[PDB]
Amino acid sequence: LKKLDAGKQIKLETTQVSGNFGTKNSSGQIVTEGNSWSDYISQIDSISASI
Amino acid sequence: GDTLSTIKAQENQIGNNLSPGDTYPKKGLSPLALNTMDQFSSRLIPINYDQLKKLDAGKQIKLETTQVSGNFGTKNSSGQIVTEGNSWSDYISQIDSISASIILDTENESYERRVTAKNLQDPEDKTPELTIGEAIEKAFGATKKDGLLYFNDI
Amino acid sequence: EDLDTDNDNIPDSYERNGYTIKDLIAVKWEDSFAEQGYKKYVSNYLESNTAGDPYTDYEKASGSFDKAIKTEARDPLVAAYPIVGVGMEKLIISTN
Ligand SMILES: [Ca+2]
Numbered sequence A: 001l002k003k004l005d006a007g008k009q010i011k012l013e014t015t016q017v018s019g020n021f022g023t024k025n026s027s028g029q030i031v032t033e034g035n036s037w038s039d040y041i042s043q044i045d046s047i048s049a050s051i
Numbered sequence B: 001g002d003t004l005s006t007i008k009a010q011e012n013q014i015g016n017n018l019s020p021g022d023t024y025p026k027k028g029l030s031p032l033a034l035n036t037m038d039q040f041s042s043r044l045i046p047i048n049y050d051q052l053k054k055l056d057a058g059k060q061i062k063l064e065t066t067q068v069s070g071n072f073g074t075k076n077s078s079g080q081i082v083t084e085g086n087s088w089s090d091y092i093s094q095i096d097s098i099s100a101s102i103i104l105d106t107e108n109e110s111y112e113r114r115v116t117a118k119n120l121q122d123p124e125d126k127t128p129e130l131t132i133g134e135a136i137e138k139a140f141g142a143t144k145k146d147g148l149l150y151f152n153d154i
Numbered sequence C: 001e002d003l004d005t006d007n008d009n010i011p012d013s014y015e016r017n018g019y020t021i022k023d024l025i026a027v028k029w030e031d032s033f034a035e036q037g038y039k040k041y042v043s044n045y046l047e048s049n050t051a052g053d054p055y056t057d058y059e060k061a062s063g064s065f066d067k068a069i070k071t072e073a074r075d076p077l078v079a080a081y082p083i084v085g086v087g088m089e090k091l092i093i094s095t096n
């Protein structure tokens, strides 16, 4: 706190994010529960070039 | 005009059964207390200091029932009645959107009924059309004697 | 015709030209139906949810979906998507 009130600033860094994607079930209804992105993040990053 | 709190019924204040015309607690029993605010009945309802000063000067706290939840019963693949997962909030709006409400006082015994009303701007609505008299006769079970409707004797 | 690509209950040609729902069946639209109160519907013939809402083309056109949604939502080209907001009325401060 003594550092904070003397002018220093707190920086916020996002280490990771989580979230689901949408897909069709046996019916025509979109379901986005249990379809995580962390399963495909590494696989996509391992075979792709970032632009 | 200040809403002090809105509290949903916890496990202590849930009525297992409520028949038509019945009451929970049943007639002849004291009213149930509602003095817990959180979800696990671990916190008591607080009020402010100015609110308490209002309360001790004669002002009254009113109670308003905004909504009511509950289940209904049906038969599964066996002959056993199951009332879990079935809710009334799925059908409340659909029933209210196509029905006309009718009430009847009859000396402190109220009846509230909903009767299907046909839409005349929809050519594909085949629900039969009823007058007000037919709707009143159907909803309350009144009988006809000489072209007039009697509820039981009134 | 009898082709059905989106595999709903409405043929593709009826979707392309025009159709109306009567007796829970989609029929070719004729201009004489407008005096009876019927409506003319046209929608995508390669999709099952033309508007993006959960209900399909046949459900919306036939009104087989929920009965509390407005009549304007029954044509396939209008989405039945609610818009809910919150409005504050007053604030109470309890000094500690
Ligand atoms: Ca089709």
Ligand SMILES: [Ca+2]
Pocket: C006, C008, C015, C043, C044, C045, C046, C047, C048, C049, C050, C057
């Ligand atoms: Ca279609």
